[PDB]
Amino acid sequence: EVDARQRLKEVEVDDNGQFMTTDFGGNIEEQFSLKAGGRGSTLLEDFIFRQKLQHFDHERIPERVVHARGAGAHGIFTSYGDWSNITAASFLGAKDKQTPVFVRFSTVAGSRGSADTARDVHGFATRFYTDEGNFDIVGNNIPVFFIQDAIRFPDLIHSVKPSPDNEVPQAATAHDSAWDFFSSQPSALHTLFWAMSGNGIPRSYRHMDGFGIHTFRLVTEDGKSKLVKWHWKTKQGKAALVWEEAQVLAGKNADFHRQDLWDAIESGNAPSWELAVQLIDEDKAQAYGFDLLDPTKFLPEEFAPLQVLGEMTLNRNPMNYFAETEQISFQPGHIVRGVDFTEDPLLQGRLYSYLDTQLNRHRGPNFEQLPINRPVSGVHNNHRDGQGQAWIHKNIHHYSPSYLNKGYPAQANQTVGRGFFTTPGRTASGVLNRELSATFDDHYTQPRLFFNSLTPVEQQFVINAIRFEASHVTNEQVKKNVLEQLNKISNDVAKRVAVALGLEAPQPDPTYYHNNVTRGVSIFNESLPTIATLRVGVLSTTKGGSLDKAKALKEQLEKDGLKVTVIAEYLASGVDQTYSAADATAFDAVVVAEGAERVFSGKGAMSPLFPAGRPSQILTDGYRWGKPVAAVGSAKKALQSIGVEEKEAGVYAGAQDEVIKGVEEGLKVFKFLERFAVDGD
Amino acid sequence: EVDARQRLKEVEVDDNGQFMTTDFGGNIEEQFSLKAGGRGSTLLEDFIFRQKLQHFDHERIPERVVHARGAGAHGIFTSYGDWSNITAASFLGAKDKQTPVFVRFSTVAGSRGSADTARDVHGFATRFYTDEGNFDIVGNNIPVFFIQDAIRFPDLIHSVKPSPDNEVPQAATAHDSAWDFFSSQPSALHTLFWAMSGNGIPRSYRHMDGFGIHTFRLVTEDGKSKLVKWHWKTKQGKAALVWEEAQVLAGKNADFHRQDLWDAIESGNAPSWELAVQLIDEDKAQAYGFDLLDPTKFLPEEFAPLQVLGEMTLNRNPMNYFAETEQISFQPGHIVRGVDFTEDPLLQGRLYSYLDTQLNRHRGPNFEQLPINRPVSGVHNNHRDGQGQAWIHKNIHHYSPSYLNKGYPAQANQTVGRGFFTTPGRTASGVLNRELSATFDDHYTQPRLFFNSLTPVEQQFVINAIRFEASHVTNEQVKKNVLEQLNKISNDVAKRVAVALGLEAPQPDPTYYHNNVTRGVSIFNESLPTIATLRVGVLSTTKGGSLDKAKALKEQLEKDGLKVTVIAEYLASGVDQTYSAADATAFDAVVVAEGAERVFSGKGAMSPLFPAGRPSQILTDGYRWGKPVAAVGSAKKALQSIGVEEKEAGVYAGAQDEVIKGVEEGLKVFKFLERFAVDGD
Ligand code: HEM
Ligand code: HEM
Ligand SMILES: *[C@@H]1O[C@H](CO)[C@@H](O)[C@H](O)[C@H]1NC(C)=O
């Protein structure tokens, strides 16, 4: 019942019932410039104009170098038990212990203003405002990353982002430079496959799993440690769109995911995730056929099962997007007592990069003093001055060691003051090198494991995604280099992808082929645990009392927890949205109300209120994109017009009571994969 | 025939055949981090990692506060004569006098990653690198602006920009706050009408007119002066898409306009505009029924006809987008000898705003020293120091007046040194006042004049635009305020828009009704003067020798200057694009090659190589959006399947010879408006 943003209330400003003022006080007006005469030039002495305009002119700050496009919200994490047996972290140190949290979801390549539903790796950054400092798990919705060394990050990001000569294409990897890098740097192949699957185009932020990706360390009070992988398990269930749907949705509504997250929290349907961890000993570093320090590899659950530690729930939206969401500054270096890093070369470089990049975004050192960045545990140190210094320090002896300050602020370590400490057992041994380990060399085995662990239709989506993006590559040799690398993962994949490009795939390379499968890498395979907050489009008409029983259909669906929108020609009594403003991409299921066949047919389907064939296009798109479709009573003729029979799965024709039962259980399936063709008939 | 970017060659860096280096020199490698042991931690002493990563972390600069999304290219302006009789401007001082130029086109509301095909006002900024300093004409594609005073600019943008709590919606005025401002501030209504018309969703940057909007002054040698309006008249002709087309295009290709401009210049089809002016005497400032200081008004051509001065041709794309296009700093305050400002309250505030805003973007006062911002005429003054000072000044006596420097750099004015001078005749008179003139009061007459001067179908698109956007407003009273303001402009428009909102705004308010009409405001009325660079989608298939007919059809079509693309199931010999990658929005005309009917029906229409019903949707979308469609020989069956007549206007069935001609004639018509329904059918 405690507010998640309670600490931020002191900095909130209410402008209701007030006069307009300047930033230095004093009441004013700001609707007229000061002029020298009735039709005169504007005066330089006009201080009210310049102070207003100066602030407007300096509103924009630099966007994030990566993950510029994103959205977030506040929440509460609750620990299920006392985890002192495995870690000294205070936020996991007791049963029912609650910690405030802020989570920001994002894409990667796209700039600010780009579409939510573009194919990309997604961000999953979570902060724990704990009683021993801020702890951040900066992660993604895919358990492996492209590159093995952090020094290669600019090379990866330059290649995937728009071509520097024309800045094209926007928020897309479907171009020469991206697929040049994937083929030239074959370690990226694994994350490529995840990005080409359902994880590239998820339904929403709520329907994503999250991963810390890197192997971290969890340290106890006595110094003993264990290797750990972070996992966020979605309670809303995993769900993904189709690509042809995602493209249209990008233009129809670029704010799809952020508005979805916003509407969920406002409607009283706060999304939740369970924090889980894979715990293994130090001596299992190179035990399971790969190196745990390698970020391009994940650990199958068959070797180490998930151990649930707690649950996070996001229940408070921000009041100002910029001040909270845009200004927040996540860091993987934000670590607390009880946790420790590993020698993962990609992770190692991130610790520097995130702290450095805040100097560019916030244009100063004092970015942690911002309300959203502030901890709840207190800040006491000899840091002075800097740009935008918000506090006034009382200790005039800002140094250590010192007699004058009486040894305060004091030093804290493992035994005293509950201070951070590196794992005492950690050792370094060997020559100083600019090399990668020989255990990092395998780039093809896990990609094959991931591809094998998908369903036949899910395997088709990945191949169709590669076909689409690879066909945009103009350079012939680059496409040959791509098929060469795909052939090392799988010959059948390389064969099928080569068909679209009009090239001959190379002969089988059986070095890295295998028939192994792994658990829990699938999406369109498992049904959703709840259909709450899912969207239904009720296609109705203003003419002939069709809207009256469409409202009854809407009323019944809302009881089960569904978000319903009644569509008509114009905004009549009961109509939520017009056909002009309506699209199939904004719904999980399209239902044709009885008496609404007139808008699919001759006279009625060609009204000036909406574009030609708009009602018919919505139902057609919905069916082709695999959504549960329906048609009540005599509305089954609407299905007959588009050419869809009333027998096939995911199509529900009949009485009002039967349609509701069929549509609701159809939403659990979400996508019906039998409507999508597989290679070989 | 000189290179427009000739001066930029000196700062160009070629990295071909060279070894990798740091920014301070010395050859290096940068693909492995320096580790302490084989699987050890990364060392802090690794200077190669940090210097590489630091530059990456600090790559981004703040986007423009408005007009963030844009693109540009270099060119040459050619004056048609000696214009010393009207202006003292050097670049207009002789016949066939060439001056380098850079032009950046843009939207307004959307952020850097937003779509080109969003409905918005479009920027038209042009710089003249003259031999007497840089001269900028920062303009739009619409001749009138929303507000009358520049102090209200933050209020206008804040309302149209995304809502501050959730940052929704992106690149759109279709929300509560925007229409709340338009109704509360009636001055905005005029530009709204232009923004709701074809000017809101233009075909490309090449198919836009440009306007300086403000009344400026042209000054001669002896101090004599004339009021002037700047006009850019396109040689490519005006063209605009439909709304339903632009939405899908925003998702399919967000880089539509910038790729269009890039491909045009790259293919040797450089676009051109004519610089024209409307010259009015000083004593006739308030003679034409409105105040020429009012930015919300435009002057009809029948009162003051256009006088062409020269021609601009953009024929050199940039080599680095960031260095040239992103970094260029336009300002209306960039004025030269022979031009002067007026008492337009909106123009007055811009002079301050544009200079101040560069301090945010560039983080220093030396932004003019950037190669793209540098003038060709030279810089000599007493300005020293500042952030990123790139020069080393030799004059130690950096002040005026002075004996030690002998009075150099020297003062220049009207009579000596060809310096800048304010128009001698300009005067100020009256009380110091924070108010607008009584002559600025009319907000409803010209909006009606614009609506009257459009064609029946164009008038429908404007109403359909208002119908669409007004329905997104959730607040009932705001919609009532909108109709109340629309009713003042036109009763029929208010009533027609009201039916979509599901309420009455009936009772006529005829204070401002009239039937006057003016030339040149319409887009869809005129035919295109050229069909060069216009795109044609050739729907073909890989089976049954249909690709040979498409290849023969391609050459003859591209012979006449068109940009053809052959569509197929996969990349065959003569295939340019796959069906999976293809969409109707990328083409101006669609044509089915002979033998390619199989892909529209039965088994050929359902392949795993492309989404279900893709070939049919491309032809359907093309037809529905008023494009010229066609089919060769037996290909007429493709048109038969979608329910389209062979006879009707813009549809061309028959032999290849009779298809090539007709489609080329149809592209001159561009859009067939008879396919769109009008109110009263
Ligand atoms: C698997 C490893 C990685 C993960 C899980 C990851 C994830 C993320 C996420 C989620 C964000 C957005 C944070 C937010 O919500 O604001 C982000 C931003 C960023 N990333 Fe990474 N990324 C990884 C690799 C890297 C690497 C190797 C580098 C370079 C050393 C890097 C540099 C950055 C920087 C500079 C930002 C901007 C941070 C800010 O402006 O606050 N990332 N990353
Ligand atoms: C009178 C009609 C106006 C027109 C035609 C216009 C045009 C433009 C254009 C074309 C740009 C982008 C320039 C580029 O290509 O880089 C721009 C940006 C900008 N505008 Fe305006 N504008 C108008 C009114 C205003 C007003 C009244 C203000 C406030 C006083 C204003 C403030 C700005 C600012 C601060 C920028 C960013 C400048 C930069 O970062 O380089 N504009 N405008
Ligand atoms: C922690 O600091 C104390 C002094 O405050 C010191 O005696 C002790 O050795 C330190 N702990 C360890 C384990 O190094």
Ligand SMILES: *[C@@H]1O[C@H](CO)[C@@H](O)[C@H](O)[C@H]1NC(C)=O
């Ligand atoms: C596949 O799984 C088996 C488990 O029986 C394991 O022994 C083997 O190393 C895995 N990899 C391959 C390529 O067979």
Ligand SMILES: *[C@@H]1O[C@H](CO)[C@@H](O)[C@H](O)[C@H]1NC(C)=O
């Ligand atoms: C145009 O119509 C206006 C009505 O606002 C009228 O005042 C004016 O005399 C007309 N001018 C002409 C003749 O074009």
